[PDB]
Amino acid sequence: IPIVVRAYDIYSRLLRERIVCVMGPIDDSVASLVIAQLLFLQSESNKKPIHMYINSPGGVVTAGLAIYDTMQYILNPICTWCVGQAASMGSLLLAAGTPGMRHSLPNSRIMIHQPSIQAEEIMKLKKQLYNIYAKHTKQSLQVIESAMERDRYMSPMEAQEFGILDKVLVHPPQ
Amino acid sequence: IPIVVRAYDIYSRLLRERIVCVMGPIDDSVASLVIAQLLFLQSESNKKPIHMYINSPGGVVTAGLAIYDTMQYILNPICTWCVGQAASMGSLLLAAGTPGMRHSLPNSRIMIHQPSIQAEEIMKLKKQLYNIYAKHTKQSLQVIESAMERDRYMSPMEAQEFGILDKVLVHPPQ
Amino acid sequence: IPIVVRAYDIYSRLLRERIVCVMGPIDDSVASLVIAQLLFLQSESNKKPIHMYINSPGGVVTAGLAIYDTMQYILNPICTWCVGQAASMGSLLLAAGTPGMRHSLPNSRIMIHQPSIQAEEIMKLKKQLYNIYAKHTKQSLQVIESAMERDRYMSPMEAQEFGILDKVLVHPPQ
Amino acid sequence: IPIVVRAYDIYSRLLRERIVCVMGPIDDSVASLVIAQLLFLQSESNKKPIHMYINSPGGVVTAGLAIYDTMQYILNPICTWCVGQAASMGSLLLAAGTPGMRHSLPNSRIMIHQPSIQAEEIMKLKKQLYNIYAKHTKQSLQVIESAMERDRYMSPMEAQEFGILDKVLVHPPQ
Amino acid sequence: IPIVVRAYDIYSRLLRERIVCVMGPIDDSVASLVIAQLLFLQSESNKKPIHMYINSPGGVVTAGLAIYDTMQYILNPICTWCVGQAASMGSLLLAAGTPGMRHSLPNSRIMIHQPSIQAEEIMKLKKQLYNIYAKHTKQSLQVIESAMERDRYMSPMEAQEFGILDKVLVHPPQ
Amino acid sequence: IPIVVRAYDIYSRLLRERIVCVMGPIDDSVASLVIAQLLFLQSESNKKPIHMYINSPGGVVTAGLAIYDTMQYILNPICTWCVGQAASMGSLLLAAGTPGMRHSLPNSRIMIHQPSIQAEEIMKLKKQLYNIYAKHTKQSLQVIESAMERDRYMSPMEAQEFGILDKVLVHPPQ
Amino acid sequence: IPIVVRAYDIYSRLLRERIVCVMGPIDDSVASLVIAQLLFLQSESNKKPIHMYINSPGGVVTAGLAIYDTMQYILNPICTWCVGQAASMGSLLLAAGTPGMRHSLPNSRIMIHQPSIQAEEIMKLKKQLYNIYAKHTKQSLQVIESAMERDRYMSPMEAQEFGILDKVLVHPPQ
Amino acid sequence: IPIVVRAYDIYSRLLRERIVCVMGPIDDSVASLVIAQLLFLQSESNKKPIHMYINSPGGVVTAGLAIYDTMQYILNPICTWCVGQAASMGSLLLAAGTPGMRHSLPNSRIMIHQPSIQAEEIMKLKKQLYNIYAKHTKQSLQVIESAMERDRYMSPMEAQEFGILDKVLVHPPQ
Amino acid sequence: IPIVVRAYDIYSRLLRERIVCVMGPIDDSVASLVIAQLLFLQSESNKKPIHMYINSPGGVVTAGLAIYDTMQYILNPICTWCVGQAASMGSLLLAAGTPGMRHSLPNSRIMIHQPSIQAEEIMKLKKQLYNIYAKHTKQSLQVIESAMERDRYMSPMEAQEFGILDKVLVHPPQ
Amino acid sequence: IPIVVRAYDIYSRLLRERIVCVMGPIDDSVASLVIAQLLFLQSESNKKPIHMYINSPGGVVTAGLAIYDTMQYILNPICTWCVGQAASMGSLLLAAGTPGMRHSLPNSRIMIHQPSIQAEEIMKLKKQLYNIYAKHTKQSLQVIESAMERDRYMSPMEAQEFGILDKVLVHPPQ
Ligand SMILES: C[C@@H]1Cc2nc(NCc3ccc(Br)cc3)[nH]c(=O)c2CN1Cc1cccc(C#N)c1
Ligand SMILES: C[C@@H]1Cc2nc(NCc3ccc(Br)cc3)[nH]c(=O)c2CN1Cc1cccc(C#N)c1
Ligand SMILES: C[C@@H]1Cc2nc(NCc3ccc(Br)cc3)[nH]c(=O)c2CN1Cc1cccc(C#N)c1
Ligand SMILES: C[C@@H]1Cc2nc(NCc3ccc(Br)cc3)[nH]c(=O)c2CN1Cc1cccc(C#N)c1
Ligand SMILES: C[C@@H]1Cc2nc(NCc3ccc(Br)cc3)[nH]c(=O)c2CN1Cc1cccc(C#N)c1
Ligand SMILES: C[C@@H]1Cc2nc(NCc3ccc(Br)cc3)[nH]c(=O)c2CN1Cc1cccc(C#N)c1
Ligand SMILES: C[C@@H]1Cc2nc(NCc3ccc(Br)cc3)[nH]c(=O)c2CN1Cc1cccc(C#N)c1
Ligand SMILES: C[C@@H]1Cc2nc(NCc3ccc(Br)cc3)[nH]c(=O)c2CN1Cc1cccc(C#N)c1
Ligand SMILES: C[C@@H]1Cc2nc(NCc3ccc(Br)cc3)[nH]c(=O)c2CN1Cc1cccc(C#N)c1
Ligand SMILES: C[C@@H]1Cc2nc(NCc3ccc(Br)cc3)[nH]c(=O)c2CN1Cc1cccc(C#N)c1
Numbered sequence A, B, C, D, E, F, G, H, I, J: 001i002p003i004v005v006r007a008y009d010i011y012s013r014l015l016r017e018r019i020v021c022v023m024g025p026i027d028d029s030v031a032s033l034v035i036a037q038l039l040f041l042q043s044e045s046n047k048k049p050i051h052m053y054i055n056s057p058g059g060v061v062t063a064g065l066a067i068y069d070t071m072q073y074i075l076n077p078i079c080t081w082c083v084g085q086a087a088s089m090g091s092l093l094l095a096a097g098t099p100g101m102r103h104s105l106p107n108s109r110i111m112i113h114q115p116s117i118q119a120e121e122i123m124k125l126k127k128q129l130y131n132i133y134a135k136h137t138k139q140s141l142q143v144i145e146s147a148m149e150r151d152r153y154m155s156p157m158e159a160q161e162f163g164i165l166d167k168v169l170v171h172p173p174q
Helices: A028-044 A061-073 A086-096 A119-136 A141-149 A158-163 B010-015 B028-044 B061-073 B087-093 B119-136 B141-148 B157-161 C010-015 C028-044 C059-073 C088-095 C117-134 C141-149 C156-161 D010-015 D028-044 D061-073 D088-095 D120-134 D141-149 D156-162 E012-015 E028-044 E059-074 E090-097 E121-136 E141-147 E156-162 F012-013 F030-044 F061-073 F090-095 F119-136 F141-149 F156-162 G011-014 G028-044 G062-073 G089-096 G117-136 G143-146 G156-162 H012-016 H028-044 H063-074 H088-093 H120-138 H141-148 H156-162 I010-015 I028-044 I062-072 I088-095 I119-136 I141-149 I156-161 J012-017 J027-043 J061-074 J088-095 J119-136 J140-148 J158-160
Strands: A052-056 A078-083 A102-104 A109-111 B019-023 B050-055 B078-082 B102-104 B109-111 C019-023 C050-058 C078-086 D019-023 D050-055 D079-083 E019-023 E050-056 E078-082 E109-111 F019-023 F049-053 F078-082 G019-023 G049-054 G080-084 H019-023 H050-056 H078-086 I050-055 I078-082 J019-023 J050-055 J078-082 J109-111
Touching: A028 A052, A028 A061, A028 A078, A028 B050, A052 A086, A052 D028, A061 A086, A061 A119, A078 A086, A086 A102, A086 A119, A086 E156, A102 A158, A102 D028, A109 A158, A119 A141, A119 B157, A141 I141, A158 C050, A158 H078, B010 B019, B010 B028, B010 E050, B019 E156, B028 B050, B028 C010, B028 C050, B028 C078, B028 E121, B061 B087, B061 B119, B061 C078, B061 D141, B078 C019, B078 F090, B078 F156, B087 B102, B087 B109, B087 B119, B102 B157, B109 B157, B119 B141, B119 F156, C010 C028, C010 F012, C019 C028, C028 C059, C050 C088, C050 F012, C050 I028, C059 C088, C059 D156, C078 C088, C078 C156, C088 C117, C117 C141, C117 D061, C117 J119, C141 E078, D010 D028, D010 E028, D019 D028, D019 E028, D028 D050, D028 D061, D028 G062, D028 I078, D050 D120, D050 E028, D061 D088, D061 I141, D079 D088, D079 I156, D088 D120, D120 D141, D120 G117, D120 J140, D141 I062, E012 E019, E019 E028, E028 E050, E028 E059, E050 E090, E050 F061, E050 G080, E078 E090, E078 I141, E090 E109, E109 E156, E109 I028, E109 J109, E121 E141, E121 I119, F012 F019, F019 H028, F030 F049, F030 G011, F030 G080, F030 H141, F049 F090, F049 G156, F061 G080, F090 F119, F090 J078, F119 F141, F156 G156, G011 G019, G011 G028, G011 J027, G011 J078, G019 G028, G028 G062, G028 I050, G049 H156, G062 G089, G062 G117, G080 G089, G089 G117, G117 G143, G156 J109, H012 H019, H012 H028, H019 H028, H019 J027, H028 H050, H028 H063, H050 J027, H063 H088, H063 H120, H078 H088, H078 J027, H088 H120, H156 J019, I010 I028, I028 I050, I028 I062, I050 I088, I062 I088, I062 I119, I062 I156, I078 I088, I088 I119, I119 I141, J012 J019, J012 J027, J019 J027, J027 J061, J050 J088, J061 J119, J088 J109, J119 J140
Parallel strands: A052 A078, A078 A102, B019 B050, B050 B078, B078 B102, C019 C050, C050 C078, D019 D050, D050 D079, E019 E050, E050 E078, F019 F049, F049 F078, G019 G049, G049 G080, H019 H050, H050 H078, I050 I078, J019 J050, J050 J078
Antiparallel strands: none
16 A cells, blocks of 8 residues: 555545445444545535445445445445455445446456344344345345345346446446 | 545544544443543534444443443533444434434444343443433333343334434435 | 544543543553653643543552552642543542542442452552542541442442542533 | 655555556455556556566455456556466466566466365356456467466466467566 | 664665665565565666675575566676575575675575475476576586585585685775 | 262263253254253153253254254153253253143243344244244243343243243152 | 163164264264264165264265265165254255155254355366256256255255155154 | 272262262353262262262352252252352352251351342342342341452351351361 | 274274275374274285275375385285275375276265475475376376376266276165 | 272372372362362271372462361371472471471472462461461461561471471481
């Protein structure tokens, strides 16, 4: 994490590009940082888009739900880019983007299995996650449950036709 | 924790927005930090409100009681925002907010079970918590005990009708 | 631990409000820090009061005795504020405050039990604690020993009746 | 890691010479840093080349594939310099360089074995790697699968004739 | 590691004397740092010499080969000074210096045993080291193999007559 | 564990008195041993009763369910004696006793909270536990769910009137 | 594990009842023991059946395949009994039983997900498992794959109608 | 633990003298062993007494209560002998002995402080302990609670005066 | 590991069936035990065959070579049965069996990759392994080197075609 | 620990010579063992002497007091032999022997410092030790306190003239 050039860090100038990247497992600290960055970008401008690079092997369910609630709260359109992999919570945040701005890369893998203590609490968490999926991906609850029951990854085109993604860019279209 | 924009980081500008975030488990250090931040915001202006983002999986009983005493001591109205999950100790602070300023998010989870060496000390602490709940939630001691005896998470609407929350917002007032 | 406001840390401005915070267990380093802060505050002003916030689950006997000797040595009046829990050494430093200026929040906890290798040394230290309590709380050595034999936490009102506290404030009296 | 010469660190000036370096094992953080550096160099100039030094013993397949997708996304030609060794996951990044600009030092070691929990996921990743190698190395899928099935290190000349490298420099052009 | 004086660290000023010290075991990070320092000194001036202090108890074979390739690539004459000892890779880098500039100290010990799990890879690396020694030391492959097969250290005079060193200085000749 | 007197061990003569014991946490090995003992006692006599002492603080749900299925399969009447305590799983084993043979000592403790990765699996297991309780205790599903939702122990008389126990002996009734 | 009755152990008499118990995770040692027990029971009598109790959360794939090959090699009919739970690797052993002798208790759990570095080898093992399941359960490979692609536990009736089980007993035949 | 002389172990013959020793902390296994020994001695003879040597630094409240219930259940009179020391549970089992047979050695130490997650559970357990003490020592609940609220050790003579002991023997009756 | 019946352990009767199972990784102790068992079976009868069950994930090269030299030294024909898998040294011992007696089960996995500090020593050992394979498998050195260079598992039929096996039995000979 | 010869262990025959060796630190287990052995030797014959070899670097105060109470309780004359050393509790048990039978060896060292949580408890225990010393050694309390306050060892002759020992033997006097 070297300093890039007014003496900005690689992750400091990154946020100055309206970009909030969620790298690694999603924990309480990472969730709080992402929420703070999203709110700061909203304060800077409530109409400009905010990019979110999603590369996480999982995380906490409550953390992802808080990040999703913050994303939906702010009035900025969220462009979710799956740069790497999209685990259960990562894939949820990916699908939680604005309709028509959920992009990805050719070798990006998406997974919605949600492998997951309090039985009733986690089951109701799964129920509300199914609800969020049915809302964003424009799908039904039965198909979402059947898909999340299978422990398997999906390709960019599969995720695009299923509703998780919208576009699959290989190079900047010009 | 990158630097945002006079060379301030996330957690510094967060406190400059009259906002305090009790993130992670509540311990002696976190409790002291929250108390200092609340008192500093009071010093800045005793009239302006203070926002408290509550996302904690639990914490210490004495720490939460100290945070509650500091909140009640300062003359600033406390807007408790349940951003994520609100454990027993965090749920107390969420209920200890100003009447009419205890907000939450759609996918937030609130718990008041308080899954809790000195048996008599922790019992008196539980009684103090019952009293605080009956005071802020405008409920009785019997119902509070019955609710805190069950290990479960309440929904935003359930916590709003029970007395823990006041409003359940999805987007800012349009 | 963010930066507050000329780019002062939270704990730095804290010491600039004549406040010393004895947080967490009391050890040699914490004791040296508290002693240095007290002496520096005396240097800044020998007549202005010094506020000592006490929240500790215990500590070292010699460390608490050093802090007490430093408090008694400096001419400044020491306002001991119990914010959280006051353990053996915490409660001892609390009772060691200037008469008429020992305060505690409504839900704070006080305990002088002192749950007491050199057996004779620690016993003589215990006798010194007995004497200090008899001096400050205006109580007799017999009742002090009888109370310290019981392992329990005193409430702010109970500690005020016992002579450990002078006031139990709920809100700034105006 | 000393400071070099306006108070620039060695790795800071390194990124300031359009020179990215995938050193050590490839993980989520390292891949995120590499992607950020690549995108920042594209922002500085989308036509000037970008140098990528590869001395990695491997890493996460997802991370390397994300780095590859980022390299292919940006319009800058990527000069992949194999320094020391180019393990499986690095070898792809070494083979993914712009044609006519993939260099390697005389004593560098190249390997594409890619030693190979979700079986279907990792095997689909292996198939994607086969496709990428066939694309960049201009080789067929059968020969790539045969070469990656053998656990061995190729020499710079061997990797050059195999299509992984374009030049094997001993000294700069005289 | 104090600061020497325009507020330069001891190692920062060391690197400003055209000097790169390979201290301790040679790992990937140390190898990358040495390569970056050598290339930076080249950029500063490709004509002035570069001093390399070699004191390491071993290291990685690929790391030493990368350092050697970097040394041979840059057009700067390398003055290798053995300060304290020279392990297998250290002694190799020592012999890899410019003819007539491979100095050492009286009590400096040189070892070329190379106590070398991919067996074929390490054996091919061993053959590469044999070739490098035969090139620089101006010796044959058989004698180099016989020497590296024995696990023992060599004195500065023995290393000078064998071809590893050129001069054995005690004090600056004036 | 001394030998008692034909040179039998404590736990050996114990099983020779048709007396099985579930001590400590219930696990795969313990459950297998209990099943083997129950089947051996059935082989010895399918009509004579079998005593099951329960002093377990819990264990695996599948193990307790295996023990329960073995108890139901064997035709022997099972006298479940709650000695010390009967945690959730043990409590099921305590409730799974033959009607009119579930005994408990005065100071014994009963608890059916069942505090408990696959969400749906554990939820269906909890549903099966609800069904088993409704069957044995002659209670409804709603009351069982309400009771098991509260994390608290029950007294012998409370468990007897609730349906978990039948008799509360202090001494052998004669 | 006390001694039962000529001073036989629990697991000793268990094997003397032509009964083998695959308890806990399946490893090399456990698989070798199961194979030895099966072959010894065959030696005793090739016509008499052999009972295999299956309570395992999984284990090594090669170990389970060795157990399956031993079961199929011996001429004795294998009566599989799912007690407690039959995880993926055990489920095969449960499904590999003789047609018409695969029993399961009411609360037992069956799972065939087979959650599974030698990527190619584990995929070929998964294909062999597909073949074995298609053979024993009298189902097509497509349905077997679509079923075990989901991570879930089947009930006794579900596994019986799917082909993994034959009978679901609650009590011995009256 | 040597063999004493029909090849008896020291503990084997010890238990053959109608003597049970609760040595060390009281856990589930120790509790089960003590219960088994007591019931075996009852089986041997219900009239003859049973000697219980108590040397424990503490233990589990549930284990001590189980041992107490077993002692009260069996008709044999229990002669409690405090050897070395008697902690909370040790002293409870000591006082639980038959009246007129609770002995202790001259230098033995008795402590009933009971220094003690479920708050309500442990509190009800402490209430049960208060009741047991009031029953056996013939003391009132108020004085019992005020006594064990202090953390101190009673001498054999003091414990005899307090009602915990009946005799303090220095030598057998001459 | 129960006892089978004149009070013989399972592994004891196993060796009494002229069988020597090399289970788990091959180490010095396991190699010594296997050699001792082979020589004991030779002493019992030099004409009767000796069965060697091979289920190993790997082992030491020297250990496997010692086992091979022992197998070749004794005049008994060695029937090597691959049960579950045959790793680097396991597969070598398997191929080292007497011609016409190397058997394997349908689902067994054979691998001769031999993924193998002394470099020259291990390379000479691997050359010896090449020679042994060429001797027993009737194959040439080049093909053996090509096969062992690939990290993959051969099926029983493939290993039979490659000369490692002579038969692939599904059931005993009818 | 070999077997000596009717197939008796070294320690078993040692205990059969009326000898109890308190070897190593004195803990609850060793204390119970010594008490049991002493009582067994009493049961065998209350007139014959009992030898006690004392070689321990310390132990527990309560354990030593229990051993002392057992020694004084039994009517057998205790011959305490100091073999190698005598720590605080070891030296106490040594002095606790019968007058005229407290022997030792030439190079045996005696220490009575007693370097010693519960301050008041250990203080009263050390007072009891003072009393025991004054009783057995025929000395006063002041001298005993002054001696135990010094952290130093004593020679056999010093301990004999002080009262701890009675004789200092080198060879059996004949
Ligand atoms: C109203 C309350 C206060 C507030 N304050 C500002 N100030 C701008 C700002 C925030 C943060 C940084 Br860093 C820098 C500048 N902007 C807002 O959007 C909010 C909203 N809050 C409600 C709310 C809603 C949903 C999720 C969360 C959460 N977590 C909180
Ligand atoms: C009177 C005593 C001193 C004092 N000092 C100031 N100065 C402002 C200030 C405080 C902190 C930072 Br950082 C920056 C500026 N402001 C106050 O509100 C208090 C109140 N204190 C009593 C008190 C009451 C309740 C909880 C606690 C606690 N813990 C302490
Ligand atoms: C006389 C000796 C020197 C001295 N020096 C100053 N200078 C002011 C100062 C101190 C510290 C910081 Br940071 C900044 C400014 N002020 C004093 O009060 C003392 C007293 N000392 C005696 C003494 C008494 C009791 C406890 C301790 C202790 N520990 C030491
Ligand atoms: C459109 C989206 C936003 C964006 N923003 C800028 N700004 C320049 C800049 C970036 C970073 C630093 Br540090 C400094 C300056 N430049 C871009 O190339 C992209 C592309 N993004 C899409 C995209 C494509 C492929 C991989 C990833 C990833 N990870 C993301
Ligand atoms: C051509 C490529 C880019 C390049 N860039 C510059 N710029 C100067 C500079 C470098 C680094 C720092 Br810090 C500061 C200033 N100078 C060069 O010598 C090289 C050579 N590279 C090829 C190359 C050859 C041998 C080993 C490695 C390696 N590892 C890489
Ligand atoms: C029919 C099958 C074979 C069998 N064999 C005997 N033999 C007596 C015996 C068993 C064990 C010892 Br040790 C000593 C003597 N007795 C039986 O009850 C059963 C029942 N089995 C079915 C079954 C039912 C429920 C749970 C499990 C389980 N786990 C297994
Ligand atoms: C022919 C070969 C030798 C042999 N020997 C006997 N003896 C009886 C016996 C075995 C074991 C104990 Br313990 C006690 C008595 N009985 C047999 O079934 C076999 C079969 N063998 C082939 C074979 C097939 C499948 C899996 C494995 C494996 N692993 C091995
Ligand atoms: C009636 C039930 C069965 C029974 N069986 C016998 N047999 C004698 C015996 C027991 C053990 C060994 Br070892 C050797 C011979 N004797 C009895 O006292 C009891 C009493 N039971 C009830 C009961 C009461 C209190 C605590 C517990 C407990 N834990 C259990
Ligand atoms: C001659 C030497 C002594 C000897 N002794 C006997 N006695 C039979 C016997 C051996 C072992 C047990 Br257990 C029980 C009975 N039988 C022999 O085969 C050998 C051969 N030895 C040479 C030799 C050759 C190859 C590998 C090794 C090895 N390791 C050793
Ligand atoms: C009266 C009570 C029962 C009793 N029983 C016998 N039986 C002989 C015997 C004991 C043990 C083995 Br092993 C073998 C044979 N002999 C006795 O001395 C005692 C004395 N007891 C009281 C007592 C006094 C002092 C310390 C402790 C202690 N700890 C206990």
